[PDB]
Nucleic acid binder design. Sequence first.
RNA 1: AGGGUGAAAAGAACCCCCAUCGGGGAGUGAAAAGAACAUGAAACCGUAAGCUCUCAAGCAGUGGGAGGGGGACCAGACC
RNA 2: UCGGAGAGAGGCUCGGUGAAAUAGACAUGUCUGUGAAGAUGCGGACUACCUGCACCUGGACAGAAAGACCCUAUGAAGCU
RNA 3: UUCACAUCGACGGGAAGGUUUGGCACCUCGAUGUCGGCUCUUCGCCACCUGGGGCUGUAGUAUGUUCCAAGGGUUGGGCUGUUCGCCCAUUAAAGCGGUACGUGAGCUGGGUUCAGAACGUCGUGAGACAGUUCGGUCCAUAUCCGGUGUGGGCGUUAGAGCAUUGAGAGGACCUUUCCCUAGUACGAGAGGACCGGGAAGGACGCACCUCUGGUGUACCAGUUAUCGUGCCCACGGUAAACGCUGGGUAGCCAAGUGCGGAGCGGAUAACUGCUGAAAGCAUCUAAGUAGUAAGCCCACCCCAAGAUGAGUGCUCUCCUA
RNA 4: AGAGAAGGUCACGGCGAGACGAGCCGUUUAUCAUUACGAUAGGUGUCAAGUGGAAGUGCAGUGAUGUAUGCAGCUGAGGCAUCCUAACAGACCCACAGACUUGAAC
Lengths: 121, 221, 116, 48, 203
Amino acid sequence: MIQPQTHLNVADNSGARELMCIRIIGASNRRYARIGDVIVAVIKEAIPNTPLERSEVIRAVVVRTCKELKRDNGMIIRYDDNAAVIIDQEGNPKGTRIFGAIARELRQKFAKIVSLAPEVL
Amino acid sequence: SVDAGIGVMGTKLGMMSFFEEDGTVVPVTVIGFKEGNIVTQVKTESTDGYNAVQVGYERLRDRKLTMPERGHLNKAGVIPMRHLQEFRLVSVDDFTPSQKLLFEELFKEGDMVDISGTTIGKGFQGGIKRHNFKRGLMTHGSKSHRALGSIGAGTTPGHVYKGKKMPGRMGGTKTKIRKLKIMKIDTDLRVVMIKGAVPGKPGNLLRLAPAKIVGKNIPKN
Amino acid sequence: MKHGRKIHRLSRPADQRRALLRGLTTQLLKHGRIKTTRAKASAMRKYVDKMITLAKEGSLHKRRQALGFIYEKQIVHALFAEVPERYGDRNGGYTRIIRTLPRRGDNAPMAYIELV
Amino acid sequence: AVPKKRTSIYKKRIRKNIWKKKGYWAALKAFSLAKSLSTGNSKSFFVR
Amino acid sequence: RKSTSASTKCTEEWRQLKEAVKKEFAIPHVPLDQRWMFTLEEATGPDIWNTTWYPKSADHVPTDKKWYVVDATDLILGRMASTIAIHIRGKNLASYTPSVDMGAFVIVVNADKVAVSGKKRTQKLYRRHSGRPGGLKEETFDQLQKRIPERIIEHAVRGMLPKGRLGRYLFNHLKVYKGAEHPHQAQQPIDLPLRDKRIRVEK
RNA sequence: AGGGUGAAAAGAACCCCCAUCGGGGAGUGAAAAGAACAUGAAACCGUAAGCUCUCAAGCAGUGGGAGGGGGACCAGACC
RNA sequence: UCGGAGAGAGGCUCGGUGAAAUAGACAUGUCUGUGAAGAUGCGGACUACCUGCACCUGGACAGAAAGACCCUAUGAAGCU
RNA sequence: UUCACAUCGACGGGAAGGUUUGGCACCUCGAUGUCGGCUCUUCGCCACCUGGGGCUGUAGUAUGUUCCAAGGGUUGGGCUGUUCGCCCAUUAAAGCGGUACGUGAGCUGGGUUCAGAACGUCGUGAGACAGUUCGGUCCAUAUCCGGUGUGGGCGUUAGAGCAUUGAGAGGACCUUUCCCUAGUACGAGAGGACCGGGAAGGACGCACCUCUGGUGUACCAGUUAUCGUGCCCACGGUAAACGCUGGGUAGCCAAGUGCGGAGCGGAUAACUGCUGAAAGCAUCUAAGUAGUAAGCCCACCCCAAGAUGAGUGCUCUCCUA
RNA sequence: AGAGAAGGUCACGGCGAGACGAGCCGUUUAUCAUUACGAUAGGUGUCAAGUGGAAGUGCAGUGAUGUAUGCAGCUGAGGCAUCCUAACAGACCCACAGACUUGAAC
Ligand SMILES: [Mg+2]
Ligand SMILES: [Mg+2]
Ligand SMILES: [Mg+2]
Ligand SMILES: [Mg+2]
Ligand SMILES: [Mg+2]
Ligand SMILES: [Mg+2]
Ligand SMILES: [Mg+2]
Ligand SMILES: [Mg+2]
Ligand SMILES: [Mg+2]
Ligand SMILES: [Mg+2]
Ligand SMILES: [Mg+2]
Ligand SMILES: [Mg+2]
Ligand SMILES: [Mg+2]
Ligand SMILES: [Mg+2]
Ligand SMILES: [Mg+2]
Ligand SMILES: [Mg+2]
Ligand SMILES: [Mg+2]
Ligand SMILES: [Mg+2]
Ligand SMILES: [Mg+2]
Ligand SMILES: [Mg+2]
Ligand SMILES: [Mg+2]
Ligand SMILES: [Mg+2]
Ligand SMILES: [Mg+2]
Ligand SMILES: [Mg+2]
Ligand SMILES: [Mg+2]
Ligand SMILES: [Mg+2]
Ligand SMILES: [Mg+2]
Ligand SMILES: [Mg+2]
Ligand SMILES: [Mg+2]
Ligand SMILES: [Mg+2]
Ligand SMILES: [Mg+2]
Ligand SMILES: [Mg+2]
Ligand SMILES: [Mg+2]
Ligand SMILES: [Mg+2]
Ligand SMILES: [Mg+2]
Ligand SMILES: [Mg+2]
Ligand SMILES: [Mg+2]
Ligand SMILES: [Mg+2]
Ligand SMILES: [Mg+2]
Ligand SMILES: [Mg+2]
Ligand SMILES: [Mg+2]
Ligand SMILES: [Mg+2]
Ligand SMILES: [Mg+2]
Ligand SMILES: [Mg+2]
Ligand SMILES: [Mg+2]
Ligand SMILES: [Mg+2]
Ligand SMILES: [Mg+2]
Ligand SMILES: [Mg+2]
Ligand SMILES: [Mg+2]
Ligand SMILES: [Mg+2]
Ligand SMILES: [Mg+2]
Ligand SMILES: [Mg+2]
Ligand SMILES: [Mg+2]
Ligand SMILES: [Mg+2]
Ligand SMILES: [Mg+2]
Ligand SMILES: [Mg+2]
Ligand SMILES: [Mg+2]
Ligand SMILES: [Mg+2]
Ligand SMILES: [Mg+2]
Ligand SMILES: [Mg+2]
Ligand SMILES: [Mg+2]
Ligand SMILES: [Mg+2]
Ligand SMILES: [Mg+2]
Ligand SMILES: [Mg+2]
Ligand SMILES: [Mg+2]
Ligand SMILES: [Mg+2]
Ligand SMILES: [Mg+2]
Ligand SMILES: [Mg+2]
Ligand SMILES: [Mg+2]
Ligand SMILES: [Mg+2]
Ligand SMILES: [Mg+2]
Ligand SMILES: [Mg+2]
Ligand SMILES: [Mg+2]
Ligand SMILES: [Mg+2]
Ligand SMILES: [Mg+2]
Ligand SMILES: [Mg+2]
Ligand SMILES: [Mg+2]
Ligand SMILES: [Mg+2]
Ligand SMILES: [Mg+2]
Ligand SMILES: [Mg+2]
Ligand SMILES: [Mg+2]
Ligand SMILES: [Mg+2]
Ligand SMILES: [Mg+2]
Ligand SMILES: [Mg+2]
Ligand SMILES: [Mg+2]
Ligand SMILES: [Mg+2]
Ligand SMILES: [Mg+2]
Ligand SMILES: [Mg+2]
Ligand SMILES: [Mg+2]
Ligand SMILES: [Mg+2]
Ligand SMILES: [Mg+2]
Ligand SMILES: [Mg+2]
Ligand SMILES: [Mg+2]
Ligand SMILES: [Mg+2]
Ligand SMILES: [Mg+2]
Ligand SMILES: [Mg+2]
Ligand SMILES: [Mg+2]
Ligand SMILES: [Mg+2]
Ligand SMILES: [Mg+2]
């Protein structure tokens, strides 16, 4: 349930420490980013001397919410923080290595991302 | 509003969860039945002007029914019943007064139904709750909050419009929920499980018809 | 709204309504019959029966639970004496409510609640 | 908001008659109640 | 419950006495059919010759009135509706009075064969308005005539009847049917006289 | 700001309703004029009897008057 | 965002007591037209059984007297 | 490039509208008051998107211009007293107008720069400013109409109880990507379709509580201070309308769960047409017809015979003297 | 005029119905013996559910405290049973075979 002005942690190498979400995309006029949605964020805090400068406008996909994802098993999933992964407009992650768990719900639109994951839920 | 096929009536027993082999959980309303669903009366185009069949539903003690009504069900040769309803068909040849309906013969699995019932009465409700009015500002100076807003324009027209949305009574009405699906029929308990919500709390009275699809089940106009 | 909210409010806030009911039941157990408003009566049923059903068992536990409801000890002990005698066979339903002429001052409907 | 005019005699008589009709229903309750206490058979009721 | 107690008995009896004596001395009613200037009785009465004649209750009584039938097939809407209005109103009787109903009943049959000149079939526009804004509805004459064709002639005659109490009460005297058959045979309808030349259209 | 029961307080014994006030009889008086008392208009509040209103749009009247009722002596009139 | 539920004091019903500003008379629809140029009251259509109660505030150029703004007065006063 | 009329259209002309800046002073002065936002509508069409078309300097994709079309839609922020406007990120698109700034007896900022004060400037001066700056009180129990609901009376030609027809009225019929068709037509390539199928979304509507929860002063547990119950134990009161916290069933609720938007139905606008005269040729039109729109009307969903035109149906009841 | 038609209102017990009216359900609570219809509310008994391990008495410990008895104790606005209380007593409205005409039938 990411929405504009929400702050996020980044899940990969890409050298952004923190993102502020400004827009949800592809959802038409929706206000809610949930897992698997592309958001336009900006960089707030960066990891120094990295290809990414703060105050950059970038795309990222939301891989973790504190809201709850519902599969068809009746299974539910809730993380402790919000996080996204910074991508290209191709679906390829800019940074090459991902932290944290992800879901099998991303397997359709993003292959790379499920691949680089340390754990899958 | 000619109705496709005969429907039956039933009682809403409340909802539970229902698994499928692949572990898909569908929430289902469980619709029970009671002694009834008996054809009461039949109305011919000649006699009544149109074609319809009146089914009775709930059984009842004899005393509780009034003399006119009791006489109405004595003409049929049927047991005393609480609720009567009418279904409106295009062809009534298959039905004779006193005939009985079985919901197991009118409804298979994977079939589409339509559930009419009465809604929960929420009483007398404000503009917010009844029409989804946005509420005004809670804090900087503002005295409005849950209030209705302005109700019209200025000197002209100089009166409020008809139908202009206002607080009044909400709920408690005949509602129809189109295109539902029947997950499982239990013969032992004579119950039907339907995917999703139907109106009203348990102990309600429902009407199930086979779904009216505006292209293919109904007269064109 | 309220659907299925079953409690008797008696037009008092929670604290006062509790204390009211404690009071009224110590009165009922002390005098055996009393005159109140129909609302107060209908509300008071439940707690009367709670005390009676309580004293039918008699354990130090139960007795402590009654002492912490009723105001006057003496009445509680009297209960734990009398009840096994007087109510032993009655399975529930220990109160009669016999309604009367309304009150002159406000026209509040009155009633007589009896320990049966 | 005030009364732009003064209410006409007859309309006022109709509104007050409406308020007087509640007396009619009260008199019916009272009568029925009297005929109930006038048999001395009611165990739900008590008078002193 | 009709009380047969001596009281109500008595009262009814007495009232028929009052009525009897009031009937005997009252001036008789002489209907208007070859009604000659005066009966030796009226001659003792009020002055009805030097004042304008106004109809009394015995006259206009509903049960008397003529009935007429208009076959509306190949008639022209308006021109017929004027005739109809005249007869319903009573303007063709010597006894006509503006304040009273002296008129006839008129039965219009074949209300779907009524004819209209020029492009009106597709042009003429029947509008009616909900009373909400944006609440305007419009039909062409033809949509109407396929849907509920009686309303066309009712709507054309009601226009030419007076407006106001007498107007509406008059409007109930117009009985319209779409088929060629009317269930009024008991009332013995006469045919309607039409003195207009242009009222009959020929194709 | 608050005047005028009657000629005279003769200001109502006695009985009834009855905790008092208040009342109804009886008695006083030319009259009840009964003490909030002398003539007692209007607004305003009602009660009874006659006709009449619940498909109706209206500064409420007016000319025409259906039907119904009432007191007449110029009963063809008036209300 | 985008509202939700709850508790109290009112609101609501019943009994007791019981105001006020307001008020030519009011038998007090809508559209359009007209008109001192934004009409319940004039015209034409249209719509409307009688009458309550709870709510809402678009209208009645709603209500609370001199319009603080502008001008007038051979007005008033304070000040330079 | 040729070519006035794909698209522009100079010099001039003829209009409509009444939204800009104005002229007038018919209007109200007592307390008939301007611009922005909030809430809440509603209407117009000169059409921003969505539906159908003609022409193109239209290969395709995408345009350009124009025709019919107002059913629906028309985001969220940084910035301003602002109309205006600028930008950021989106989007199918982020239309322009009317309604006394539409809306102040619904809400709130400025504005009528009210009285305090300061700056610049003008004035000897008191003071002044279509200069700037900080501070600065609008009340309201709804009589009538209008409205949203919800009753009673009476009518409906004997009185009732049920079940319905549907005149009329409303709600809703919205939209985006993606995938087959097919990397097929089209084009040298780069690019890349019409038409018709399939899924997922958005907004909106109708319900609902199985799951995930919110509240839950019904309840359960911890726990601080303190006064009660004779004292320990254990409970009760108070710490407003929970002392403070941690949970919570039923209800109510959404962020949760379902479902909806169907029509080889009818008639049209633009347009495309077929037979075909008046003018032995031609012509979509004069006769007569054929396709065709998110528009119009039925169908869908609720209401509905006070529909006084008061409907139809089934049954019941009308005793005694 | 007696009586009280069918039905209605009131009363009485209620509600997932409700501002009030309105709506809906009840009003002796069955019999059964093979279906179902005769439990409205409260109480009582049991069940789901919540909370999370009662008091008392034992043991361990210098003690705060832990541990056993015990899915305990409290609660149970939800179900299902059972007439134990209250649905007692009752009251009011209400019964011109449906004015008049005309055809048709007999
Ligand atoms: Mg029934
Ligand atoms: Mg409710
Ligand atoms: Mg808001
Ligand atoms: Mg506030
Ligand atoms: Mg109170
Ligand atoms: Mg407290
Ligand atoms: Mg309990
Ligand atoms: Mg005396
Ligand atoms: Mg005393
Ligand atoms: Mg005395
Ligand atoms: Mg005397
Ligand atoms: Mg004397
Ligand atoms: Mg006097
Ligand atoms: Mg009418
Ligand atoms: Mg009438
Ligand atoms: Mg009138
Ligand atoms: Mg709330
Ligand atoms: Mg509250
Ligand atoms: Mg107070
Ligand atoms: Mg009161
Ligand atoms: Mg006064
Ligand atoms: Mg009126
Ligand atoms: Mg003019
Ligand atoms: Mg006008
Ligand atoms: Mg008018
Ligand atoms: Mg007039
Ligand atoms: Mg005139
Ligand atoms: Mg208003
Ligand atoms: Mg208000
Ligand atoms: Mg007006
Ligand atoms: Mg006026
Ligand atoms: Mg001068
Ligand atoms: Mg001077
Ligand atoms: Mg040209
Ligand atoms: Mg002037
Ligand atoms: Mg004013
Ligand atoms: Mg256009
Ligand atoms: Mg287009
Ligand atoms: Mg084009
Ligand atoms: Mg090209
Ligand atoms: Mg449009
Ligand atoms: Mg529109
Ligand atoms: Mg629009
Ligand atoms: Mg598009
Ligand atoms: Mg505005
Ligand atoms: Mg606008
Ligand atoms: Mg206003
Ligand atoms: Mg300021
Ligand atoms: Mg100077
Ligand atoms: Mg300050
Ligand atoms: Mg009022
Ligand atoms: Mg009103
Ligand atoms: Mg009404
Ligand atoms: Mg009614
Ligand atoms: Mg009636
Ligand atoms: Mg009737
Ligand atoms: Mg229906
Ligand atoms: Mg219809
Ligand atoms: Mg109507
Ligand atoms: Mg419609
Ligand atoms: Mg459609
Ligand atoms: Mg190719
Ligand atoms: Mg397609
Ligand atoms: Mg969808
Ligand atoms: Mg839930
Ligand atoms: Mg639940
Ligand atoms: Mg909680
Ligand atoms: Mg909950
Ligand atoms: Mg002590
Ligand atoms: Mg405590
Ligand atoms: Mg204390
Ligand atoms: Mg204190
Ligand atoms: Mg307190
Ligand atoms: Mg808590
Ligand atoms: Mg949903
Ligand atoms: Mg065509
Ligand atoms: Mg062509
Ligand atoms: Mg030719
Ligand atoms: Mg040709
Ligand atoms: Mg043609
Ligand atoms: Mg078509
Ligand atoms: Mg279409
Ligand atoms: Mg479509
Ligand atoms: Mg009817
Ligand atoms: Mg009639
Ligand atoms: Mg009876
Ligand atoms: Mg009732
Ligand atoms: Mg009740
Ligand atoms: Mg009884
Ligand atoms: Mg029970
Ligand atoms: Mg129960
Ligand atoms: Mg223990
Ligand atoms: Mg404890
Ligand atoms: Mg030890
Ligand atoms: Mg448990
Ligand atoms: Mg039993
Ligand atoms: Mg009993
Ligand atoms: Mg007859
Ligand atoms: Mg006869």
